[PDB]
């Protein structure tokens, strides 16, 4: 009777915008919601030598990509479920919905 929603993105603002939309939808009706839970951030770090050749002092680059996450649990109600299915995410946000 409860649905679990997972969100992920490389941009922290869009994540919050989608989460706030969901929270407003839930408040706009009588329905209980387990608040947006922050899960640990994924960091992808890659270290490379800079020079194309092998001459000179050795220096390095440290490139990093960060992926943020959220978790929301809300009880499945048809009046509210359609609304959260009608909301469309920006192109840099991944959303998945499952029934538990």
């Amino acid at each position: 009777q409860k649905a679990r929603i997972k969100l992920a993105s490389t941009n922290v603002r869009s994540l919050e915008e989608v989460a706030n939309q969901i929270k407003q939808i839930a408040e706009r009706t009588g329905v209980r919601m387990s608040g947006p839970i922050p899960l640990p951030t994924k960091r992808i770090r890659i270290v490379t030598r800079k020079s194309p050749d092998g001459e000179g002092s050795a220096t390095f680059d440290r490139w990093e990509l960060r992926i943020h996450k959220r978790l929301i649990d809300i009880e499945a109600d048809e009046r509210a479920m359609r609304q959260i299915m009608r909301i469309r995410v920006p192109e840099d946000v991944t959303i998945e919905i499952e029934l538990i």
Partner: peptide
């Protein structure tokens, strides 16, 4: 996992 999707 999820990282492999974003990079792809």
């Amino acid at each position: 996992a999820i990282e492999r999707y974003f990079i792809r």
